[PDB]
Write a protein that binds this ligand. Structure first.
Ligand SMILES: Cc1cc2nc3c(=O)[nH]c(=O)nc-3n(C[C@H](O)[C@H](O)[C@H](O)COP(=O)(O)O)c2cc1C
Lengths: 386, 145
């Protein structure tokens, strides 16, 4: 999501002659994402091809994917370079998967990508494989030792048990992933020598994915300070259960309750406080002083006392947080950067217009008819202080 | 309010990076040392050292490795036609017509099999393939005359 959302890195990774999946978690519409593919295909040199990643998590995205898949359908009906589709966070049911495989863009899909997290999820994909035996299906088996979206399932035991049934389908391409930064450590899974430690006879793999080790890369949009942070983090051997920051890495749960692997060394303030607040919420009112100050430490600022705070302080706080002085929102608008906050600028307007709405005793003729003009209002907007 | 949309601050932000949720994995972090190392370098580093390990023991300076530095191939012109499912026209990608030419053809003909230069694959759909000017592969389809 953060890493591959940039059209620059996914292009550069592909231009290096490598397979990559464009992130869909950073694209909220067909149009905004169609810009990325267009930026991709422009940065895509002749013939080179890439794939796309999608999430199963929420209904709104799955309804957006109906427009998204038809976008992928339209793109490839137009002959777009994107040669694959990646379903994430869950395995679609047979009728849902058949649809994806059999789409008008099917040949341009050329294979389908699934990411099973459990034994049952693996067995589900096997049934998707037997569905269309002539359709290539790349099964990426991840761990919970991996980054981001998490799981309680071991790296080995899952693949150790399900491998035999996975190889009874020729259309299944087995790909091991997670906790791999190097060719040396990942060489044994390729030779099949990795299963020998568990006594099982050799168990070779068809491919390997690297999520984490590519985050510190040059063409990645990761900030200079964030890269240095990922670097100095020391790594670990097989994941341990004991709750702590483990080798600069501690798990944490998202808003939905699912675990997320985040960096607890580079940033120790957000994760641990979150675990404090989460486990502490009954009595929050009692610890309010301790809790409200810690939000300010991680820069999740509450506002100074709500009543007593002057309307300036309100309106000056939004400008403070929304408008960066270094990036110069006015100068940020000119390149037409995707980082543009314009909803935040629109947010501040609705607050400004509310301020006029609150204090005006008269008919509201002079004030409202001015700031609402395009040419006039937009000029007023690029200069927040004025 | 806390956890929502926390993934974007790691990229292009001047703020203190110790306040941000940034996502590694636990064990993969050990393999992360070099900073601002180009994607092309990391991915090749994987492939190049995987090749050497495979080369040294089993292959021992294989014909495949030697053929590469000397430019020799697998899947020549005749195979490439029957291999790649995608047929490019300009910047657009199309399915290989041979897939629908090979089997569905009533009369299909492969001329001079073992000889590569003279190799020709023709069909009753009136579509024929041959090589011209070295690397250029010539597919010739016809309607009536
Ligand atoms: C920052 C980040 C974002 C990720 N986003 C997604 C995602 O949107 N969908 C998905 O299936 N996996 C996602 N992953 C997981 C990777 O696709 C991959 O499975 C995992 O990172 C591989 O494990 P490793 O990086 O620890 O070696 C993400 C991983 C990271 C580090």
């Amino acid at each position: 999501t953060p890493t591959t959302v940039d059209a620059k890195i996914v292009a550069a990774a592909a231009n290096a002659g490598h397979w990559a999946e464009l992130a869909g978690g950073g694209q909220v519409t067909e149009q905004i994402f169609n810009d990325r593919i267009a930026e991709l295909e422009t940065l895509l040199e002749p013939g080179r091809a890439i794939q796309f990643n999608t999430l199963f998590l929420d209904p709104y995205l799955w309804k957006l994917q109906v427009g998204g898949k038809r976008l992928v359908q339209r793109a490839r009906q137009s002959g777009a370079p994107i040669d694959g589709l990646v379903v994430s966070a869950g395995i679609p049911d047979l009728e849902e998967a058949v649809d994806i495989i059999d789409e008008l863009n099917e040949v341009g899909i050329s294979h389908v990508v699934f990411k099973p997290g459990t034994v049952e999820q693996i067995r589900s994909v096997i049934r998707i494989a037997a569905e269309v035996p002539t359709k290539p299906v790349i099964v990426h088996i991840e761990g919970g030792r991996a980054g981001g979206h998490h799981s309680w399932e071991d790296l080995d035991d899952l693949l150790l048990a399900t491998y035999s049934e996975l190889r009874s389908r020729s259309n299944i391409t087995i790909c091991v992933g997670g906790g791999i930064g190097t060719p040396e450590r990942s060489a044994e899974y390729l030779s099949g020598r990795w299963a020998e430690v568990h006594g099982y006879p050799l168990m070779p793999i068809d491919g390997i994915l690297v999520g984490t080790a590519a985050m510190a890369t040059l063409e990645a949009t990761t900030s200079p300070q964030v890269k240095q942070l990922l670097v100095e983090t020391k790594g670990t051997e097989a994941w341990v259960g004991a709750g702590k920051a483990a080798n600069g890495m501690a798990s944490g749960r998202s808003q939905l309750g699912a675990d997320i692997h985040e960096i607890d060394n580079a940033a120790s303030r957000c994760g641990r406080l979150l675990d404090e607040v989460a486990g502490d919420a009954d009595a929050v009112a009692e610890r309010r002083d301790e809790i409200i100050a810690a939000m300010a430490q991680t820069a999740k600022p509450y506002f100074g006392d709500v009543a007593e705070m002057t309307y300036l302080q309100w309106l000056r706080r939004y400008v403070e947080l929304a408008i960066g002085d270094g990036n110069s929102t006015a100068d940020t608008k000119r390149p037409d950067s995707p980082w543009l906050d314009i909803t935040w600028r629109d947010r501040f307007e609705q607050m400004l217009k509310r301020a006029e709405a609150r204090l005006h005793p008269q008919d509201f003729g002079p004030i409202e008819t001015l700031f609402d003009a395009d040419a006039d209002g937009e000029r007023l907007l690029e200069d927040p202080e004025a | 309010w806390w956890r929502s949309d926390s993934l974007w601050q790691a990229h292009d932000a001047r703020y203190e990076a110790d306040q941000v949720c940034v996502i590694p994995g636990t064990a993969a972090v050990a393999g992360i040392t070099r900073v601002d190392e180009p994607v092309g370098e990391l991915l090749d580093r994987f492939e190049q050292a995987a090749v050497d390990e495979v080369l040294g023991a089993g292959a021992e300076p294989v014909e495949v490795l030697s053929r590469r530095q000397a430019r020799r191939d697998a899947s020549g012109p005749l195979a490439v036609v029957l291999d790649a499912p995608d047929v490019l026209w300009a910047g657009r990608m199309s399915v290989n017509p041979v897939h629908r030419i090979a089997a569905p053809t009533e009369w299909q003909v492969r001329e001079g099999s073992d000889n590569r230069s003279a190799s020709h694959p023709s069909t009753g759909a009136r579509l024929e393939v041959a090589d011209d000017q070295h690397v250029v592969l010539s597919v010739p389809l016809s309607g009536t005359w």
